[PDB]
Symmetry: C3
Subunit: 356 residues, 3 copies
């Protein structure tokens, strides 16, 4: 009976190996991606940060610093003079007046006309590494009534001919409550547009709903934003080796009073915002919206200085949803199948063996 | 033997529960989406409806009604005068003459030159809520030979300087035989372009082949179009509480002779076309083509009044096909697996039990 | 016992059919597509071929041939004159001087400024069916630092006013080492742009990683390129029935000395490049990158003759990966399940039967 026992042990070994592999596969939680094209009646506007060009590319700030006798690429030296402070050095980069309106034109009606909703999340002041910027929270989702839906950022500043006036701005569309993106990466990930002519963008939406797993955990939008903001600030402070902050930093430490400290912080933040995408520690989000930006063309030319439009005309959002493809039912079915192939013992056999 | 019987009944219960869940899963027909990027040698042109701006935004119609002493936003009062009829009130919005050509430039040949096919589904007259419009059926699929493939809608109307001439039109790309889209939603879902300069669009194709299931049934394109058109017409008639029709309606009832009836129908159709997307009853289609519209730029400037181009330069259509992921073979395999785990009885055991 | 034996044979038949179908399904290797949106820190630039317009659409070449007394559409007759050769007839179509630079602007730094890398794969000379063209190999992947990443092809040729100067060129973005695409299909699949104004494109990336299967085998990029190039050349030679080559052909046979041979080769290559997509024999690649081309707008206007830009501002590449969904473990589990349903015999029963 030696051969029969050898066959029995071989069958037990193969069955044990197969059940172990099945259980490991279930534990790994394999996932599959379902791609849908969902048409919504209300689009979630991305948060918009409109900055001036970076300090070096900015024309007004560069002209001011040259007028003060200090060449660009080293503007931070302005902090040395008692009449200039970092807050003032960064308020000099302001490009939008107090008359900044963010209208929301949601389609049109064949009987009444076009809907205009000027009371749409009026822009507020933010401090970016590019200077002083305008942030536009997405207070409510825009009702999509047609390809005429858009958001119009318009500033009618008294653009007199006495002084040189801006030739470009940097507009960045990002997640709703990502303070780090608005205050650090607008200068890098913001599309440059001229204000001389009324511009118009177009936004398509690719939503990605990842899956929360043991090896790829999730964090809500707030958790991810807080994680990345804290990581960026702590990394900047570690790199700069200084107790400081700059207008683009949370009120944690006091502003620098000397150019050296500010320049060290600036270099540190440059390196961080450059290399933080891969070296960040906190986990990804599983509600990740991508705003594909195309370039519309405007037939209507307005006389407002900084007329700007962003059109949301495509309501078919591409939703990529990740779902678990292996369940407990499937694992039990596969285990029972392998048993019926190799061992051929149900739980009744186990009960009989245990009793005896 | 009480404990053994308790174990037997517990095993039977768990096996019954698992088989019931497996059968329910199979009955629900779970589906999976396969995303392909298919390159075709012949592109299916979308149907194009070119309208004037909506009656209020239209400049020629507004100027005419003001010349007649009636301000816009209430133009329907024109029906009161015996010399004006609704058909005439809507023929006043015509913007394209009888000389409207729809050429089809399908790539080019390095030896012969560019292929021009002027005999491509010449535009015909349609009546939209925007007025009198030009509809261009897709008679045949355009042969894709390169990024130079496009369809050119050109009208050389005698645009004399005596009278104000149009500054914009509304072009809507939609499914092939969707009369409701052409005659109701062009004013809402149609991109506005100026005729002063030769325009050019660009169309990318996202085909979605859904699956016909018990809980998500299908209907052919004709069935869906007929359903939605009948629903829109019936809902407009229910809302307006009047026996009427307007040029943008099928020849079912006669045209109104009084402004009140026409205005009631107009309000009803506005509300319908606004809210019919979600409250429609008939089932969706599972051959659903999406036309992503980008904005090309034309280096060549022509002297024709309403020169217009639509380029189909990307032949990689994104096909999202939905297929059933659970089959009868799989269900039987899973049921047998759970039996081999818990019960360990094949059909032979069933035969033996039945005989005894 | 006849009924019992009939039931046994029926169960054996159904089980055999089910196991055969399961094994056939496993052998067919069903596949599933996973769609990811991967954000990279370095983008792989597509290879760029910038040609003049096709010989007929080209203005400089057409003007030259008309000046020589030979009308276009038959320019090959120039070979008849001893003072003209095919190499000279195709060097007459040159549009770019020796001062062609391909700079690579990879984002910008808030402290240092914009990164410019003029030493990025300087363009070299290629011979296309469109004439003499400029090919730009992708030496290295561009580091993506922001939406300001782009590649600038700039030629400052001495564009004097004495002679007519080019009004358009044809720029084609294709796989890295696809010589056939560069030398044959640029005139067909190349976007036409004017040089009078500084142009700017925008490239989005859709990578497709197909699966190598018995019924749909794979070939590396080099293998596919070599296959298709050899197929195109051999098919052209078979069709033209002549021992020749043209500047757009590999140095295999000598150049024609008579117009008839060159014209026959030209017609043959036209037909080939037209119809080779479907009638090609060698297998597809499973690393297939698609370059979706949108149209950017440039706010800055330069004075260089042929200033041209291609922006890579979207780093979220859409990766469609094809993976096998049925494995050996799954097949064994399903086979065991069907056995436990119908037969109820493990391998131990097989051993017992074999011994007895």
């Amino acid at each position: 009976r030696a051969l029969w026992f050898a066959g029995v042990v071989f069958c037990f070994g193969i069955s044990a190996h197969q059940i172990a592999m099945h259980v490991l596969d279930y534990l790994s939680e394999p996932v599959a991606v379902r791609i849908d094209f969902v048409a919504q009646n209300e689009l979630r506007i991305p948060e918009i940060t409109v900055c001036p060009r970076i300090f070096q590319q900015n024309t007004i700030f560069t002209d001011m610093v040259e007028k003060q006798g200090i060449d660009k690429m080293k503007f931070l030296d302005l902090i040395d003079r008692p009449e200039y402070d970092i807050m003032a050095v960064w308020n000099l980069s302001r490009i939008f007046s107090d008359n900044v309106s963010c209208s929301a034109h949601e389609g049109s009606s064949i009987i009444s006309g076009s809907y205009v909703d000027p009371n749409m999340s009026q822009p507020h002041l933010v401090y970016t590494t590019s200077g002083q910027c305008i942030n536009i929270p997405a207070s409510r989702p825009l009702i999509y009534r047609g390809v005429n839906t858009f958001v119009r950022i318009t500033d009618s500043q008294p653009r007199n001919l006495n002084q040189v006036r801006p030739e470009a701005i940097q507009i960045y569309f990002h997640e709703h409550h990502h303070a780090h993106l608005s205050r650090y990466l607008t200068g890098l990930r913001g599309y440059i547009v001229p204000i001389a002519n009324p511009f118009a963008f177009s936004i398509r939406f690719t939503q990605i709903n990842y899956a929360n797993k043991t090896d790829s955990p999730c964090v809500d939008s707030e958790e991810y934003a807080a994680c990345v903001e804290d990581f960026i600030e702590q990394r900047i402070y570690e790199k700069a080796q200084v107790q400081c902050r700059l207008p683009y930093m949370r009120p944690k430490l006091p502003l620098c009073s000397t150019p050296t400290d500010a320049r060290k912080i600036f270099v540190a933040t440059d390196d961080v915002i450059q290399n933080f995408e891969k070296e960040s520690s906190c986990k990804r989000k599983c509600e990740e919206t991508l705003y594909i930006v195309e370039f519309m063309h405007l037939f209507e030319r307005s006389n407002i200085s900084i007329d700007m439009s962003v059109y949301f005309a495509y309501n078919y959002i591409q939703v990529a949803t990740e779902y678990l493809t292996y369940t407990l039912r499937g694992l039990l079915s596969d285990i029972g199948g392998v048993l019926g192939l190799f061992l051929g013992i149900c739980i009744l056999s186990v009960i009989e063996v245990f009793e005896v």
